Design a protein around this ligand. Structure first.
Ligand SMILES: [Mg+2]
Length: 95
DNA sequence: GGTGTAAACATGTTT
DNA sequence: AACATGTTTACACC
């Protein structure tokens, strides 16, 4: 079965996991399948949602590659702690 | 209101 | 001329 984490959670967990807090798009792919074996099936479906979420939400901001050798994906510092307890189940509220 | 899924579309890198 | 990477629009679900 599918894990209960949203794609926003999946992408956030990947970014927070990188030692430099920056991650390749495909680094996000490898992170998810390594952690959640559900996603080794029918990649074309869910990997498109990953791409789609990165551009939609203003919380995932794309930063250019420091230099060559795609581009890195970061978290906007406002949404670094969307999830409060590190359970990644629900997002805590504000405003 | 924020999700999930599908699709069209537009650049960029790799056979 | 196959791919990967982003951007955006559209609809059902909760
Ligand atoms: Mg974005």
């Amino acid at each position: 079965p599918k894990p209960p984490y949203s794609y926003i959670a999946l992408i956030t967990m990947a970014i927070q996991n990188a030692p430099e807090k920056k991650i390749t798009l495909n680094g996000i792919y490898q992170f998810i399948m390594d952690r959640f074996p559900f996603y080794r099936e029918n990649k074309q479906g869910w990997q498109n949602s990953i791409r789609h979420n990165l551009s939609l939400n203003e919380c995932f901001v794309k930063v250019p590659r420091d230099d060559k050798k795609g581009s890195y994906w970061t978290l906007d510092p406002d949404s670094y702690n969307m999830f409060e307890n590190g359970s990644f189940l629900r997002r805590r509220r504000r405003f």
